[PDB]
């Protein structure tokens, strides 16, 4: 418990490599947030939007 | 650029689409710049049998 200062650095890049991570799969209001599913579902120019 | 085509197949007549008169018969590419005009034709382009 007293590496404290130490630990945290740890935690934290974790913590912040873990929440950019897990943002792939957010949809940002998308049909579906895996991007091969979206080609699946739709033609060209719905897709791209 | 001129043809005739079913009243249906109109659709495709624009960039992206998928179909067979978009697949087998004319083409517009995605950053198509133009305007795609059509009107109904069966006084002239039509025949009894």
Redesign the interface.
Request: net charge negative.
């Given at each position: 418990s007293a590496l404290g200062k130490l630990q945290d650095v740890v935690n934290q890049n974790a913590q912040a490599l873990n929440t950019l991570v897990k943002q792939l799969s957010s949809n940002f209001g998308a049909i579906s947030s895996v991007l091969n599913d979206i080609l699946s579902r739709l033609d060209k120019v719905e897709a791209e939007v | 650029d001129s043809f005739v085509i079913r009243g249906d197949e109109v659709r495709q007549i624009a960039?992206?689409?998928?179909g067979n008169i978009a697949d087998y018969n004319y083409k517009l590419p995605?950053d198509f710049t133009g305007c795609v005009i059509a009107w109904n034709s069966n006084n002239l382009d039509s025949k009894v049998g």
């Open positions: - | 960039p992206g689409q998928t995605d």
